[PDB]
Amino acid sequence: HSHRQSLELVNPGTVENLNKEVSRDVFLSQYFFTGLRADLNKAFSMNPAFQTSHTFSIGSQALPKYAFSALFANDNLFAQGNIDNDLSVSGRLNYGWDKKNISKVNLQISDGQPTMCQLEQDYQASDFSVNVKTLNPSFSEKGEFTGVAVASFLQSVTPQLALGLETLYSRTDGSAPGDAGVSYLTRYVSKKQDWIFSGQLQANGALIASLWRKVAQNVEAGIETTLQAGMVQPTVEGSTTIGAKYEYRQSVYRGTLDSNGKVACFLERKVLPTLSVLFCGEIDHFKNDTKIGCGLQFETAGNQELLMLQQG
Amino acid sequence: HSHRQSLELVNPGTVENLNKEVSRDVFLSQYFFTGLRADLNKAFSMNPAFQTSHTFSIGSQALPKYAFSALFANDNLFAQGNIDNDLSVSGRLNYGWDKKNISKVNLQISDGQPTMCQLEQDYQASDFSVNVKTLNPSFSEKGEFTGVAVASFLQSVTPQLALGLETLYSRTDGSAPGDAGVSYLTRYVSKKQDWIFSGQLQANGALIASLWRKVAQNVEAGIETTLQAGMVQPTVEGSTTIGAKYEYRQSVYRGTLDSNGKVACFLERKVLPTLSVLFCGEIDHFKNDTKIGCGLQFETAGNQELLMLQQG
Amino acid sequence: SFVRNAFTKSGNLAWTLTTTALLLGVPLSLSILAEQQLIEMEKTFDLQSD
Amino acid sequence: SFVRNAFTKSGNLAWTLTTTALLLGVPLSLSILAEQQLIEMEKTFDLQSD
Amino acid sequence: ERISKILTLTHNVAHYGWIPFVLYLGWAHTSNRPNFLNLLSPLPSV
Amino acid sequence: ERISKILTLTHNVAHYGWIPFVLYLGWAHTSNRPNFLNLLSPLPSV
Amino acid sequence: FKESPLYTIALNGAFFVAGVAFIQSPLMDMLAPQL
Amino acid sequence: FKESPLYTIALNGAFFVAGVAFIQSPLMDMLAPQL
Amino acid sequence: EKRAHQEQTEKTLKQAAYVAAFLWVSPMIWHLVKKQW
Amino acid sequence: EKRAHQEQTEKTLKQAAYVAAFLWVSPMIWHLVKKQW
């Protein structure tokens, strides 16, 4: 359509990256841990990005006692294995057929919940991004679909505004009809890109709305709320979170306040270009109990060229 | 006695200071804490040493939620009050009648175990040191002594060796005869004073022996063992501890290994001349559980002269 | 006493505020101090250069 | 298998040793690094003086 | 009798005024003699 | 039938050789080609 | 005391609006260090 | 397996002696950093 | 019961397709609106 | 029973005094020993 091409709209980010600027950047949800934990990373090659990690976490229930994890990546290929104590294997592979077209497969294998298999194919266009993923996909003798399949579509209505929906198909056993749900997603970006707003009308009447603002090159802040719902009368269990992140040439700081009353901060001192020390403390004023954990990021290499590059 | 004076022996340290070089210097027993804790200290005068402290400890069972504590000291006088959350008052007063003669009184007051009163009189001589303390002293209608009274005597047999005994008198109620026990103490100091050995044959057949060595101006190490005893057959429950301390112009480090398998370290970074940051982490390999706690030592003053001195 | 209840509640609130302020300010204070110290460093090395 | 038991026990022992070594070495390493950095500082300021 | 009454009376005196004793001593000895409110507060006045 | 056998067979292949796949890929691509023992160990060899 | 089901959403929305206004206010700008 | 009451004291004494020898050995000296 | 569940799922998918087309053409209608005013 | 407890405590205190005097004179006897050898 010729007359439709005049708009010249920009491709919005993928659906998963909707809350990246807030959830994964200006919040501790991902970076937080507990108790001591040492992370040793070994670099072997850069142009072909290859790496070997280790982990020694003690006192953290979420983290494992030990975790070996080797990461490889190239221009169009990316892979990552993750051995875990108790021989819990986790793996992920990302292959880019085209510059803008990439297919990703994730597989976690263990003794509990054996072989959760996820495969998804991502497409990115000039103005829209669509990705479809299938959780624990399989087939049945009756021939109907089995497992969970999710398809998400996001189209930029205007250069500063992108709207999209997320389709969900789930079928636990196959005997009963597979429940399906739809969620609406919205992403607003300021003309100057100074601040970004994202809204997610998740299924089951749950709203996840967040805001992001770049105060300056060092300081960016954002907030996020939630309005989960229920029924025995309706039960609504939500929380509002305010978080700010300070980044500097030597350290990165993240702070966050929770409507539940808990307060948390996350500091990362780059004492050396390689070695980085992480501190992570949280308080729970409602119950008056504190979560705390320090860490390490020892960052050795294994090649003379890599060491020379590391030192400059 | 004229012929006895020729020895010219040195006064050994007080009985309580027997294990100071190890217990209170090269070990975390006193410095250790848990969870976050902020310590604000205010200095008001130096020639008359006056100070006002505050504490905000959260997550530490031993520590209180808040603790206000004002310390005053002069050439011959020293006092210290300590208000604690729940209005638990603690107090101590030290008065020096003579340069070598000092009387100390300690009093802790609360709702549980009300008014534990301790008074003691310390004497230091050319070659011997004697101190007597009375715990919860009182009198009874029957006239017999009540409370616990302890008298300790320590005499330097030779310049490099000091032996002493500790007498204990305890009477809980007064109706029953007051149990009394005696403990033997020994302190050996190298001719060069490079290393110090201390031995304590405590009562009830408990031996607390420790060693101390000054590796260099920055590094000193020491070990300590214990052999507590019991009866239903005899039960012996002891632990051997090895500890080392590294001190530097910017930080102080203390590490310790326990025969029980737990490992602990204690770092104190003096980021600023006033502000000091404390880290304290411990592991328990027998049960695979970790104790950890950071802290602060904010060190403001309140006088222009004090601030000028602080900055140099 | 109701006055006593208000007093203790206010004290608890002040304690909570101070604890939160410390927890969220101290690490940021260290970060700012380190960054400004590094800025002074670079300035000193430059002054050395010229 | 007894060989398997020995293997897992040895792995656990190595993990314990490495964890203890890190816990007792990292803070001391930071202290040594800070002290040597301050020594270099003082040397640099002196070199500035003369 | 009297000496045991004094025991309790002095224990109460300690409980209720030991810290004020130290504070008054410091404020009197200090040449600056800072106000009570600032003296108590953990903020620098200089 | 065959496609469901392949499902399990490939899941086992993943479980038992995914990490070795990544390690071999890296060691082949790397020009240094470090020995396996050093490659695994978290120690610098340079 | 009411604590209606709607009360939670009303409180969270009020907090969200206040936070948004604050972040976009000049106050946030003043927070960011000069250096 | 015996684990006698005397076993605990024997083990603790052995640990104490080993630690004392180590601390007074040149090895402790080598531990102390040159700088 | 499977009847109602299947019908509801099918209608959900149909409505999803409808809104997907709506989004596909959204820039077009927005351009038309801009032209109108 | 108080009889035995009191006697034991008294004997403990007496032995404590004996060893206290022993320590008081210890440098004297050590000097004598040094003179002997």
Side-chain angles (χ1 to χ4, degrees), chain A residues 195 197 209-211 213 215 219 221-223 225-227 236 238-240 246 248 259, chain G residues 5-6 8-9 11-13 15-17 19-20 22-25 28-29 31-33 35:
Chain A
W195 63 278
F197 172 94
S210 89
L211 175 63
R213 195 205 159 183
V215 184
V219 184
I223 84 180
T225 194
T226 311
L227 286 180
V236 281
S239 74
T240 303
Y246 289 65
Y248 293 104
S259 181
Chain G
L6 71 83
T8 296
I9 164 161
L11 171 151
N12 277 11
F15 270 131
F16 184 97
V17 163
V20 165
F22 174 21
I23 275 175
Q24 297 218 129
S25 82
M28 182 36 49
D29 227 333
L31 157 50
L35 84 82

mmCIF file of all heavy atoms in Angstrom, chain A residues 195 197 209-211 213 215 219 221-223 225-227 236 238-240 246 248 259, chain G residues 5-6 8-9 11-13 15-17 19-20 22-25 28-29 31-33 35:
data_model
loop_
_atom_site.group_PDB
_atom_site.id
_atom_site.type_symbol
_atom_site.label_atom_id
_atom_site.label_comp_id
_atom_site.label_asym_id
_atom_site.label_seq_id
_atom_site.Cartn_x
_atom_site.Cartn_y
_atom_site.Cartn_z
ATOM 1 N N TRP A 195 11.417 10.081 28.465
ATOM 2 C CA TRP A 195 10.653 9.213 29.346
ATOM 3 C C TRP A 195 9.817 8.251 28.518
ATOM 4 O O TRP A 195 9.332 8.593 27.437
ATOM 5 C CB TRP A 195 9.745 10.021 30.270
ATOM 6 C CG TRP A 195 8.717 10.812 29.536
ATOM 7 C CD1 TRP A 195 8.887 12.031 28.950
ATOM 8 C CD2 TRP A 195 7.354 10.441 29.305
ATOM 9 N NE1 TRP A 195 7.714 12.445 28.370
ATOM 10 C CE2 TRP A 195 6.757 11.486 28.574
ATOM 11 C CE3 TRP A 195 6.581 9.329 29.647
ATOM 12 C CZ2 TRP A 195 5.424 11.451 28.178
ATOM 13 C CZ3 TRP A 195 5.259 9.296 29.254
ATOM 14 C CH2 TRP A 195 4.692 10.350 28.527
ATOM 15 N N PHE A 197 6.643 5.303 28.789
ATOM 16 C CA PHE A 197 5.527 4.729 29.524
ATOM 17 C C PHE A 197 5.130 3.410 28.881
ATOM 18 O O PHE A 197 5.104 3.289 27.652
ATOM 19 C CB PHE A 197 4.325 5.677 29.549
ATOM 20 C CG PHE A 197 3.080 5.061 30.124
ATOM 21 C CD1 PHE A 197 2.764 5.220 31.460
ATOM 22 C CD2 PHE A 197 2.224 4.320 29.325
ATOM 23 C CE1 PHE A 197 1.622 4.653 31.985
ATOM 24 C CE2 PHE A 197 1.082 3.752 29.847
ATOM 25 C CZ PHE A 197 0.782 3.920 31.178
ATOM 26 N N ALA A 209 1.302 -1.563 34.959
ATOM 27 C CA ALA A 209 1.650 -0.292 34.348
ATOM 28 C C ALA A 209 2.908 0.261 34.999
ATOM 29 O O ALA A 209 3.079 0.170 36.219
ATOM 30 C CB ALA A 209 0.505 0.715 34.485
ATOM 31 N N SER A 210 3.786 0.833 34.180
ATOM 32 C CA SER A 210 5.061 1.346 34.652
ATOM 33 C C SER A 210 5.424 2.595 33.866
ATOM 34 O O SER A 210 4.928 2.829 32.762
ATOM 35 C CB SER A 210 6.174 0.301 34.511
ATOM 36 O OG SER A 210 6.795 0.401 33.241
ATOM 37 N N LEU A 211 6.312 3.396 34.452
ATOM 38 C CA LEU A 211 6.814 4.608 33.824
ATOM 39 C C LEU A 211 8.329 4.641 33.951
ATOM 40 O O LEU A 211 8.897 4.127 34.917
ATOM 41 C CB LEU A 211 6.207 5.865 34.460
ATOM 42 C CG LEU A 211 6.742 7.206 33.954
ATOM 43 C CD1 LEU A 211 6.427 7.384 32.482
ATOM 44 C CD2 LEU A 211 6.165 8.354 34.758
ATOM 45 N N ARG A 213 11.814 7.310 33.187
ATOM 46 C CA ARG A 213 12.333 8.626 32.851
ATOM 47 C C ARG A 213 13.843 8.631 33.017
ATOM 48 O O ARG A 213 14.372 8.077 33.985
ATOM 49 C CB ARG A 213 11.721 9.722 33.727
ATOM 50 C CG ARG A 213 11.947 11.119 33.178
ATOM 51 C CD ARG A 213 11.913 12.178 34.260
ATOM 52 N NE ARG A 213 12.600 13.391 33.836
ATOM 53 C CZ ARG A 213 12.770 14.463 34.596
ATOM 54 N NH1 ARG A 213 12.299 14.519 35.831
ATOM 55 N NH2 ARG A 213 13.426 15.510 34.104
ATOM 56 N N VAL A 215 16.541 10.926 33.919
ATOM 57 C CA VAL A 215 16.830 12.228 34.511
ATOM 58 C C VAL A 215 18.079 12.824 33.880
ATOM 59 O O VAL A 215 18.112 14.002 33.507
ATOM 60 C CB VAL A 215 16.979 12.102 36.037
ATOM 61 C CG1 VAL A 215 17.176 13.473 36.659
ATOM 62 C CG2 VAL A 215 15.770 11.403 36.631
ATOM 63 N N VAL A 219 21.451 9.130 35.882
ATOM 64 C CA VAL A 219 20.303 8.855 36.735
ATOM 65 C C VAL A 219 19.083 8.608 35.861
ATOM 66 O O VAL A 219 18.733 9.447 35.023
ATOM 67 C CB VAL A 219 20.040 10.011 37.714
ATOM 68 C CG1 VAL A 219 18.899 9.659 38.651
ATOM 69 C CG2 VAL A 219 21.301 10.334 38.492
ATOM 70 N N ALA A 221 14.977 6.873 36.506
ATOM 71 C CA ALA A 221 14.035 6.406 37.509
ATOM 72 C C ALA A 221 12.779 5.878 36.837
ATOM 73 O O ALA A 221 12.474 6.210 35.688
ATOM 74 C CB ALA A 221 13.664 7.519 38.496
ATOM 75 N N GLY A 222 12.053 5.042 37.572
ATOM 76 C CA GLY A 222 10.813 4.481 37.075
ATOM 77 C C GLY A 222 10.018 3.856 38.195
ATOM 78 O O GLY A 222 10.562 3.484 39.238
ATOM 79 N N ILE A 223 8.710 3.745 37.963
ATOM 80 C CA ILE A 223 7.791 3.161 38.928
ATOM 81 C C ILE A 223 6.943 2.117 38.217
ATOM 82 O O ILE A 223 6.801 2.123 36.994
ATOM 83 C CB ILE A 223 6.895 4.224 39.601
ATOM 84 C CG1 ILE A 223 5.670 4.546 38.739
ATOM 85 C CG2 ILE A 223 7.689 5.486 39.857
ATOM 86 C CD1 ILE A 223 4.755 5.577 39.359
ATOM 87 N N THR A 225 3.286 -0.508 39.093
ATOM 88 C CA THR A 225 2.210 -0.938 39.969
ATOM 89 C C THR A 225 1.613 -2.236 39.444
ATOM 90 O O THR A 225 1.892 -2.672 38.324
ATOM 91 C CB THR A 225 1.126 0.141 40.081
ATOM 92 O OG1 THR A 225 0.255 -0.164 41.177
ATOM 93 C CG2 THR A 225 0.316 0.224 38.799
ATOM 94 N N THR A 226 0.780 -2.857 40.274
ATOM 95 C CA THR A 226 0.152 -4.121 39.928
ATOM 96 C C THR A 226 -1.194 -4.203 40.629
ATOM 97 O O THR A 226 -1.370 -3.665 41.725
ATOM 98 C CB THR A 226 1.031 -5.311 40.322
ATOM 99 O OG1 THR A 226 2.369 -5.096 39.856
ATOM 100 C CG2 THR A 226 0.488 -6.595 39.724
ATOM 101 N N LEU A 227 -2.147 -4.866 39.982
ATOM 102 C CA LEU A 227 -3.514 -4.938 40.484
ATOM 103 C C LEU A 227 -4.084 -6.342 40.308
ATOM 104 O O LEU A 227 -5.208 -6.526 39.836
ATOM 105 C CB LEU A 227 -4.394 -3.893 39.802
ATOM 106 C CG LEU A 227 -4.156 -2.458 40.270
ATOM 107 C CD1 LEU A 227 -5.067 -1.485 39.538
ATOM 108 C CD2 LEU A 227 -4.344 -2.347 41.775
ATOM 109 N N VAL A 236 -8.310 -8.298 45.487
ATOM 110 C CA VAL A 236 -7.344 -7.537 44.702
ATOM 111 C C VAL A 236 -6.083 -7.391 45.538
ATOM 112 O O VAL A 236 -6.125 -6.852 46.650
ATOM 113 C CB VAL A 236 -7.888 -6.161 44.287
ATOM 114 C CG1 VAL A 236 -8.822 -6.301 43.094
ATOM 115 C CG2 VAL A 236 -8.590 -5.480 45.454
ATOM 116 N N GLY A 238 -2.324 -5.912 45.096
ATOM 117 C CA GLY A 238 -1.454 -5.121 44.260
ATOM 118 C C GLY A 238 -0.375 -4.442 45.081
ATOM 119 O O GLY A 238 -0.470 -4.321 46.302
ATOM 120 N N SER A 239 0.663 -3.998 44.377
ATOM 121 C CA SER A 239 1.760 -3.275 44.996
ATOM 122 C C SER A 239 2.299 -2.242 44.020
ATOM 123 O O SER A 239 2.396 -2.489 42.817
ATOM 124 C CB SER A 239 2.887 -4.220 45.426
ATOM 125 O OG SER A 239 3.620 -4.676 44.303
ATOM 126 N N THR A 240 2.653 -1.079 44.558
ATOM 127 C CA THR A 240 3.266 -0.003 43.796
ATOM 128 C C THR A 240 4.726 0.115 44.207
ATOM 129 O O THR A 240 5.037 0.154 45.402
ATOM 130 C CB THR A 240 2.540 1.322 44.034
ATOM 131 O OG1 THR A 240 1.156 1.181 43.694
ATOM 132 C CG2 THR A 240 3.158 2.432 43.199
ATOM 133 N N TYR A 246 21.370 4.798 39.820
ATOM 134 C CA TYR A 246 22.489 5.704 39.598
ATOM 135 C C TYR A 246 23.650 4.898 39.041
ATOM 136 O O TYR A 246 24.071 3.909 39.650
ATOM 137 C CB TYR A 246 22.896 6.411 40.891
ATOM 138 C CG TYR A 246 21.900 7.444 41.354
ATOM 139 C CD1 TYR A 246 20.623 7.077 41.752
ATOM 140 C CD2 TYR A 246 22.235 8.788 41.391
ATOM 141 C CE1 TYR A 246 19.709 8.019 42.174
ATOM 142 C CE2 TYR A 246 21.331 9.738 41.810
ATOM 143 C CZ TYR A 246 20.069 9.347 42.201
ATOM 144 O OH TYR A 246 19.166 10.294 42.620
ATOM 145 N N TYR A 248 27.642 5.082 37.393
ATOM 146 C CA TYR A 248 28.859 5.870 37.334
ATOM 147 C C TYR A 248 29.984 5.010 36.783
ATOM 148 O O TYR A 248 29.887 3.782 36.717
ATOM 149 C CB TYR A 248 29.229 6.431 38.710
ATOM 150 C CG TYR A 248 28.238 7.447 39.215
ATOM 151 C CD1 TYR A 248 27.318 7.122 40.199
ATOM 152 C CD2 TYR A 248 28.219 8.735 38.701
ATOM 153 C CE1 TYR A 248 26.409 8.051 40.659
ATOM 154 C CE2 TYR A 248 27.316 9.671 39.152
ATOM 155 C CZ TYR A 248 26.413 9.325 40.131
ATOM 156 O OH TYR A 248 25.511 10.260 40.579
ATOM 157 N N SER A 259 5.377 -0.537 48.008
ATOM 158 C CA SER A 259 4.147 -0.209 48.718
ATOM 159 C C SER A 259 3.913 -1.156 49.885
ATOM 160 O O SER A 259 3.212 -0.803 50.841
ATOM 161 C CB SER A 259 2.956 -0.255 47.763
ATOM 162 O OG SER A 259 1.756 0.079 48.438
ATOM 163 N N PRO G 5 -12.590 -3.720 48.638
ATOM 164 C CA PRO G 5 -11.748 -4.216 47.539
ATOM 165 C C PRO G 5 -11.267 -3.092 46.640
ATOM 166 O O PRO G 5 -10.120 -3.109 46.180
ATOM 167 C CB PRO G 5 -12.662 -5.195 46.788
ATOM 168 C CG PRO G 5 -13.875 -5.393 47.628
ATOM 169 C CD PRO G 5 -13.811 -4.518 48.834
ATOM 170 N N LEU G 6 -12.124 -2.103 46.386
ATOM 171 C CA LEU G 6 -11.728 -0.954 45.584
ATOM 172 C C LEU G 6 -10.702 -0.077 46.292
ATOM 173 O O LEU G 6 -10.018 0.710 45.630
ATOM 174 C CB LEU G 6 -12.964 -0.130 45.215
ATOM 175 C CG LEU G 6 -13.652 0.669 46.328
ATOM 176 C CD1 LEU G 6 -12.991 2.026 46.580
ATOM 177 C CD2 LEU G 6 -15.127 0.847 45.992
ATOM 178 N N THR G 8 -7.876 -0.870 47.757
ATOM 179 C CA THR G 8 -6.513 -1.210 47.362
ATOM 180 C C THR G 8 -6.166 -0.599 46.011
ATOM 181 O O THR G 8 -5.096 0.000 45.842
ATOM 182 C CB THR G 8 -6.348 -2.730 47.325
ATOM 183 O OG1 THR G 8 -6.523 -3.266 48.641
ATOM 184 C CG2 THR G 8 -4.968 -3.107 46.806
ATOM 185 N N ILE G 9 -7.059 -0.744 45.031
ATOM 186 C CA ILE G 9 -6.788 -0.191 43.707
ATOM 187 C C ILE G 9 -6.729 1.328 43.773
ATOM 188 O O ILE G 9 -5.894 1.954 43.114
ATOM 189 C CB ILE G 9 -7.825 -0.666 42.671
ATOM 190 C CG1 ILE G 9 -7.760 0.214 41.420
ATOM 191 C CG2 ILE G 9 -9.238 -0.589 43.213
ATOM 192 C CD1 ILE G 9 -8.376 -0.421 40.194
ATOM 193 N N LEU G 11 -5.831 3.243 46.325
ATOM 194 C CA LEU G 11 -4.541 3.596 46.911
ATOM 195 C C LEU G 11 -3.373 3.396 45.950
ATOM 196 O O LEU G 11 -2.485 4.251 45.855
ATOM 197 C CB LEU G 11 -4.334 2.969 48.295
ATOM 198 C CG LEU G 11 -2.937 3.089 48.910
ATOM 199 C CD1 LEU G 11 -3.025 3.094 50.425
ATOM 200 C CD2 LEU G 11 -2.033 1.950 48.444
ATOM 201 N N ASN G 12 -3.356 2.273 45.229
ATOM 202 C CA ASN G 12 -2.257 2.022 44.307
ATOM 203 C C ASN G 12 -2.264 3.025 43.163
ATOM 204 O O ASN G 12 -1.205 3.499 42.740
ATOM 205 C CB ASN G 12 -2.338 0.593 43.777
ATOM 206 C CG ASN G 12 -1.711 -0.405 44.723
ATOM 207 O OD1 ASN G 12 -1.387 -0.073 45.864
ATOM 208 N ND2 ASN G 12 -1.528 -1.629 44.256
ATOM 209 N N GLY G 13 -3.446 3.361 42.647
ATOM 210 C CA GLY G 13 -3.524 4.369 41.603
ATOM 211 C C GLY G 13 -3.077 5.733 42.084
ATOM 212 O O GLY G 13 -2.394 6.465 41.360
ATOM 213 N N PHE G 15 -0.904 6.286 44.492
ATOM 214 C CA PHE G 15 0.549 6.204 44.597
ATOM 215 C C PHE G 15 1.201 6.315 43.228
ATOM 216 O O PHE G 15 2.216 7.002 43.069
ATOM 217 C CB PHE G 15 0.953 4.893 45.273
ATOM 218 C CG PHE G 15 1.052 4.978 46.771
ATOM 219 C CD1 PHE G 15 0.435 4.032 47.570
ATOM 220 C CD2 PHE G 15 1.769 5.995 47.381
ATOM 221 C CE1 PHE G 15 0.526 4.100 48.947
ATOM 222 C CE2 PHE G 15 1.861 6.069 48.756
ATOM 223 C CZ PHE G 15 1.239 5.120 49.540
ATOM 224 N N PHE G 16 0.637 5.636 42.228
ATOM 225 C CA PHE G 16 1.197 5.685 40.884
ATOM 226 C C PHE G 16 1.164 7.103 40.331
ATOM 227 O O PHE G 16 2.147 7.584 39.758
ATOM 228 C CB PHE G 16 0.424 4.731 39.971
ATOM 229 C CG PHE G 16 0.976 4.638 38.577
ATOM 230 C CD1 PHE G 16 1.835 3.612 38.226
ATOM 231 C CD2 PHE G 16 0.626 5.570 37.613
ATOM 232 C CE1 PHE G 16 2.338 3.519 36.943
ATOM 233 C CE2 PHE G 16 1.129 5.481 36.331
ATOM 234 C CZ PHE G 16 1.985 4.456 35.996
ATOM 235 N N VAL G 17 0.031 7.789 40.489
ATOM 236 C CA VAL G 17 -0.086 9.150 39.974
ATOM 237 C C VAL G 17 0.901 10.068 40.679
ATOM 238 O O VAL G 17 1.570 10.896 40.042
ATOM 239 C CB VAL G 17 -1.532 9.654 40.123
ATOM 240 C CG1 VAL G 17 -1.586 11.169 39.990
ATOM 241 C CG2 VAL G 17 -2.423 8.993 39.091
ATOM 242 N N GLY G 19 3.739 9.260 42.130
ATOM 243 C CA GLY G 19 5.082 8.943 41.683
ATOM 244 C C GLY G 19 5.372 9.477 40.296
ATOM 245 O O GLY G 19 6.466 9.978 40.030
ATOM 246 N N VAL G 20 4.399 9.371 39.391
ATOM 247 C CA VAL G 20 4.592 9.885 38.037
ATOM 248 C C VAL G 20 4.809 11.390 38.076
ATOM 249 O O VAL G 20 5.758 11.918 37.479
ATOM 250 C CB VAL G 20 3.391 9.512 37.149
ATOM 251 C CG1 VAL G 20 3.395 10.341 35.871
ATOM 252 C CG2 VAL G 20 3.410 8.027 36.837
ATOM 253 N N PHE G 22 5.844 13.226 40.546
ATOM 254 C CA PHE G 22 7.135 13.495 41.165
ATOM 255 C C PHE G 22 8.266 13.291 40.164
ATOM 256 O O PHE G 22 9.112 14.173 39.977
ATOM 257 C CB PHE G 22 7.309 12.585 42.383
ATOM 258 C CG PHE G 22 8.664 12.667 43.037
ATOM 259 C CD1 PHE G 22 9.488 13.769 42.863
ATOM 260 C CD2 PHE G 22 9.113 11.627 43.831
ATOM 261 C CE1 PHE G 22 10.727 13.826 43.467
ATOM 262 C CE2 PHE G 22 10.350 11.681 44.437
ATOM 263 C CZ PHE G 22 11.157 12.781 44.255
ATOM 264 N N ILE G 23 8.288 12.136 39.500
ATOM 265 C CA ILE G 23 9.382 11.828 38.585
ATOM 266 C C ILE G 23 9.462 12.874 37.483
ATOM 267 O O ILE G 23 10.554 13.318 37.107
ATOM 268 C CB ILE G 23 9.212 10.410 38.010
ATOM 269 C CG1 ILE G 23 9.809 9.385 38.974
ATOM 270 C CG2 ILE G 23 9.873 10.303 36.638
ATOM 271 C CD1 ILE G 23 9.579 7.953 38.567
ATOM 272 N N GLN G 24 8.315 13.286 36.948
ATOM 273 C CA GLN G 24 8.317 14.293 35.895
ATOM 274 C C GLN G 24 8.414 15.714 36.437
ATOM 275 O O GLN G 24 8.491 16.656 35.642
ATOM 276 C CB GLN G 24 7.062 14.151 35.032
ATOM 277 C CG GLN G 24 6.972 12.822 34.305
ATOM 278 C CD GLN G 24 6.400 12.960 32.910
ATOM 279 O OE1 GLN G 24 6.980 12.474 31.939
ATOM 280 N NE2 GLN G 24 5.255 13.624 32.803
ATOM 281 N N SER G 25 8.420 15.892 37.753
ATOM 282 C CA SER G 25 8.525 17.217 38.335
ATOM 283 C C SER G 25 9.971 17.698 38.334
ATOM 284 O O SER G 25 10.904 16.899 38.235
ATOM 285 C CB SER G 25 8.002 17.208 39.765
ATOM 286 O OG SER G 25 9.003 16.741 40.653
ATOM 287 N N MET G 28 12.614 15.860 40.819
ATOM 288 C CA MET G 28 13.465 14.766 40.371
ATOM 289 C C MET G 28 14.749 15.306 39.762
ATOM 290 O O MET G 28 15.843 14.801 40.042
ATOM 291 C CB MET G 28 12.713 13.909 39.351
ATOM 292 C CG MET G 28 13.476 12.694 38.824
ATOM 293 S SD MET G 28 14.542 11.834 40.005
ATOM 294 C CE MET G 28 13.451 11.628 41.419
ATOM 295 N N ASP G 29 14.633 16.341 38.930
ATOM 296 C CA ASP G 29 15.812 16.956 38.333
ATOM 297 C C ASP G 29 16.763 17.465 39.407
ATOM 298 O O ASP G 29 17.979 17.246 39.326
ATOM 299 C CB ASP G 29 15.393 18.094 37.405
ATOM 300 C CG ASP G 29 16.102 18.051 36.070
ATOM 301 O OD1 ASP G 29 17.232 17.524 36.012
ATOM 302 O OD2 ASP G 29 15.529 18.543 35.075
ATOM 303 N N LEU G 31 17.119 16.323 42.301
ATOM 304 C CA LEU G 31 17.741 15.193 42.978
ATOM 305 C C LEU G 31 19.041 14.796 42.289
ATOM 306 O O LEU G 31 20.061 14.569 42.952
ATOM 307 C CB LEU G 31 16.782 14.004 43.021
ATOM 308 C CG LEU G 31 17.421 12.619 43.190
ATOM 309 C CD1 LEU G 31 18.408 12.572 44.362
ATOM 310 C CD2 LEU G 31 16.357 11.549 43.337
ATOM 311 N N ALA G 32 19.033 14.727 40.962
ATOM 312 C CA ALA G 32 20.203 14.259 40.236
ATOM 313 C C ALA G 32 21.408 15.127 40.588
ATOM 314 O O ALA G 32 21.320 16.359 40.508
ATOM 315 C CB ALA G 32 19.950 14.293 38.729
ATOM 316 N N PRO G 33 22.537 14.536 40.976
ATOM 317 C CA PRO G 33 23.661 15.351 41.449
ATOM 318 C C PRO G 33 24.179 16.281 40.364
ATOM 319 O O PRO G 33 24.196 15.946 39.178
ATOM 320 C CB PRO G 33 24.714 14.310 41.848
ATOM 321 C CG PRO G 33 24.391 13.114 41.036
ATOM 322 C CD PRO G 33 22.902 13.113 40.855
ATOM 323 N N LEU G 35 27.275 17.140 39.956
ATOM 324 C CA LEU G 35 28.447 16.473 39.408
ATOM 325 C C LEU G 35 28.110 15.029 39.060
ATOM 326 O O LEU G 35 28.747 14.415 38.205
ATOM 327 C CB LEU G 35 29.611 16.533 40.401
ATOM 328 C CG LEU G 35 29.677 15.469 41.505
ATOM 329 C CD1 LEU G 35 30.302 14.164 41.020
ATOM 330 C CD2 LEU G 35 30.442 16.013 42.703
#
